[PDB]
Amino acid sequence: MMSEIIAVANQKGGVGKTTTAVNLAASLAVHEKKILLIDFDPQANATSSLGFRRDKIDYDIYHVLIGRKQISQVILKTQMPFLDLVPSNLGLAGFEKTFYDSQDENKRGELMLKNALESVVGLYDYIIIDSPPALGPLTINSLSAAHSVIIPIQCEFFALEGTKLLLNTIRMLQKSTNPKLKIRGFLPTMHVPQLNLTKGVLAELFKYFDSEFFRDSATGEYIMIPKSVKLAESPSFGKPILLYDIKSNGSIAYQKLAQSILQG
Amino acid sequence: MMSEIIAVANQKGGVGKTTTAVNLAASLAVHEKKILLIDFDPQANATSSLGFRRDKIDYDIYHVLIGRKQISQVILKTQMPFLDLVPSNLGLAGFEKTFYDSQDENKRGELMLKNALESVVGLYDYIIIDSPPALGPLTINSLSAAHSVIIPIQCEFFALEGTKLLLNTIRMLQKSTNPKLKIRGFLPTMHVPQLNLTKGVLAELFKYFDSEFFRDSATGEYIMIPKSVKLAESPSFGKPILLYDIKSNGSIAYQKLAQSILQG
Numbered sequence: 001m002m003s004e005i006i007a008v009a010n011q012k013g014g015v016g017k018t019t020t021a022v023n024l025a026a027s028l029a030v031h032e033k034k035i036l037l038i039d040f041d042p043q044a045n046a047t048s049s050l051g052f053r054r055d056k057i058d059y060d061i062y063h064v065l066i067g068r069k070q071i072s073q074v075i076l077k078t079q080m081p082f083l084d085l086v087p088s089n090l091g092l093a094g095f096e097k098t099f100y101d102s103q104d105e106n107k108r109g110e111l112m113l114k115n116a117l118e119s120v121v122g123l124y125d126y127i128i129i130d131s132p133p134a135l136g137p138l139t140i141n142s143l144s145a146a147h148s149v150i151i152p153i154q155c156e157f158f159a160l161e162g163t164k165l166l167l168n169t170i171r172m173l174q175k176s177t178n179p180k181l182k183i184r185g186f187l188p189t190m191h192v193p194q195l196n197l198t199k200g201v202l203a204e205l206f207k208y209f210d211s212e213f214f215r216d217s218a219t220g221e222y223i224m225i226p227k228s229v230k231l232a233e234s235p236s237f238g239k240p241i242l243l244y245d246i247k248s249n250g251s252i253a254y255q256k257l258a259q260s261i262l263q264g
Numbered sequence: 265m266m267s268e269i270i271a272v273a274n275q276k277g278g279v280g281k282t283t284t285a286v287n288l289a290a291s292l293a294v295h296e297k298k299i300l301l302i303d304f305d306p307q308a309n310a311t312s313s314l315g316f317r318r319d320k321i322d323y324d325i326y327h328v329l330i331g332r333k334q335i336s337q338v339i340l341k342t343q344m345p346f347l348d349l350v351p352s353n354l355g356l357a358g359f360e361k362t363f364y365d366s367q368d369e370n371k372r373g374e375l376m377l378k379n380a381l382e383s384v385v386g387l388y389d390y391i392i393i394d395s396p397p398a399l400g401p402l403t404i405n406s407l408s409a410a411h412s413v414i415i416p417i418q419c420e421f422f423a424l425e426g427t428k429l430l431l432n433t434i435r436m437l438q439k440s441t442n443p444k445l446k447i448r449g450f451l452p453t454m455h456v457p458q459l460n461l462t463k464g465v466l467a468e469l470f471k472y473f474d475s476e477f478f479r480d481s482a483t484g485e486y487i488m489i490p491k492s493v494k495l496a497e498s499p500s501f502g503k504p505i506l507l508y509d510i511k512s513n514g515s516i517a518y519q520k521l522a523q524s525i526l527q528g
């Protein structure tokens with residue numbers, strides 16, 4: 001209902017999905033908009049990014065999906081008063097099995113996350129979903145639950161084929177399980193402007209998808225997350241970058257992203 | 265000939281599994297060892313890396329796993345006479361369902377790739393398997409088919425939690441479906457030595473797993489693949505780095521890796 005649910009998705013591995021989900025969630029939360037981050041990857045990197053140890057997590061999103069727990073029972077408060085987390089753990093890897101079992105019986109396996117979110121949509125301004133690297137049941141559940149999708153894009157070769165495919169999947173879902181699903185935007189990540197490869201991949205993407213790239217709401221510039229040493233360091237301190245170095249380039253870029261989201 | 269089957273595996277996305285599988289395969293082939301590269305990711309990045317279009321592949325590894333085709337029917341010659349490829353395609357994403365069906369009926373499924381490889385173990389010196397980013401059915405099959413596993417590691421924060429988890433899976437399989445399974449080695453990838461994060465992560469990894477790291481036997485040095493612009497460029501040209509810039513640091517490093525493999 002009230003919450004805009006935003007999936008951060010891209011089947012390619014290591015393109016900044018988690019970094020984006022975490023830092024966007026934080027960058028929205030610092031405005032005292034109430035944010036819920038869903039770690040929807042069994043590797044649980046978002047969870048770890050916010051300083052939570054895998055060995056310290058009790059019940060997680062998986063338990064909610066299978067009905068062992070209500071989502072209110074697993075929600076954790078973070079260092080930021082307006083950022084809450086539904087953590088992940090290894091047991092989310094069991095989801096696939098569950099999914100297929102669901103499909104065999106009268107159930108809509110693609111909607112399990114959507115259903116799980118039902119009881120908190122009226123309680124948050126934004127729900128941000130960190131998706132895993134594939135187009136399987138988990139990512140399908142993420143996209144099926146979302147109002148909109150942010151696609152982080154690393155400008156290297158595999159990005160070209162990959163983006164097209166993700167778009168295909170999205171359109172599939174638009175014609176089936178989630179008609180209202182929109183692209184919130186493409187977000188270049190780990191961006192190194194002067195590389196020939198970067199320029200080539202970007203130019204190719206602009207040709208088809210110019211209108212999909214995030215724009216700075218004050219200046220009209222394209223929003224891109226620069227490759228940043230500090231950004232890589234941040235999960236090692238268990239904090240979003242804005243909590244300790246708010247003037248760093250990565251922090252600044254993610255805050256521009258949040259402003260863009262807050263406007264609509 | 266009796267193939268050594270080597271899985272390139274790591275559930276983390278974008279850590280150089282594909283770059284490593286492709287370039288190790290090429291680096292072995294130039295020594296007139298007959299290599300079979302198995303693309304075991306539905307995204308088919310290895311396939312694309314060798315100049316094959318996804319939309320142009322007829323039958324792939326998927327069809328072999330489910331018994332529709334014998335593996336000899338899907339093998340493609342590449343630009344290099346000693347390097348053959350079993351290509352992948354999106355339909356490989358259907359394997360999961362099959363796997364779970366199998367687990368449900370007789371608790372089998374882990375050995376489907378192994379079984380598929382039986383008829384070519386006498387025809388190649390090495391079979392290199394490019395694994396997808398997760399610890400699901402595909403990675404389980406890759407590891408269950410292998411003599412040994414190469415674990416590429418990007419030395420950033422998530423490497424710590426991840427590596428331990430991968431070891432757990434390996435141990436599990438060592439206790440179940442694949443007793444002979446060994447770690448061939450850990451391989452730092454996209455390596456930038458002077459970064460504080462890299463130093464910290466490497467120190468922790470040496471602390472627990474020093475003995476697992478790949479070594480150059482001539483110097484005792486740790487083998488690491490340097491971050492390389494040319495390495496990132498090469499798949500865009502459909503070539504292994506040794507065909508694209510044989511004198512580049514990435515090419516040199518992968519040839520060292522091949523030496524480490526060839527020496528035993």
Ligand SMILES: Nc1ncnc2c1ncn2[C@@H]1O[C@H](COP(=O)(O)OP(=O)(O)OP(=O)(O)O)[C@@H](O)[C@H]1O
Pocket residue numbers: 012013014015016017018019020041045131132133189190191225226227228229231232233235250275276277278397420421422
């Ligand atoms: N803008 C950036 N600058 C420098 N390093 C970054 C940046 N963004 C992400 N990283 C680092 O690159 C690595 C990969 O990022 P990340 O884990 O967020 O991607 P991912 O898409 O979630 O990966 P996966 O597919 O495995 O889920 C991480 O170690 C992360 O810390």
Ligand SMILES: Nc1ncnc2c1ncn2[C@@H]1O[C@H](COP(=O)(O)OP(=O)(O)OP(=O)(O)O)[C@@H](O)[C@H]1O
Pocket residue numbers: 011012013014133156157158276277278279280281282283284305309395396397453454455489490491492493495496497499514
């Ligand atoms: N040593 C390197 N230097 C520079 N770029 C690299 C290096 N190794 C890999 N890359 C690039 O980083 C990206 C990720 O590498 P790669 O696709 O091989 O990882 P992966 O583990 O196979 O990811 P996935 O889990 O999605 O299959 C690729 O764009 C690749 O070209």
Ligand SMILES: [Mg+2]
Pocket residue numbers: 017018019041045046131132
């Ligand atoms: Mg992630």
Ligand SMILES: [Mg+2]
Pocket residue numbers: 281282283305309310394395396
């Ligand atoms: Mg790959």
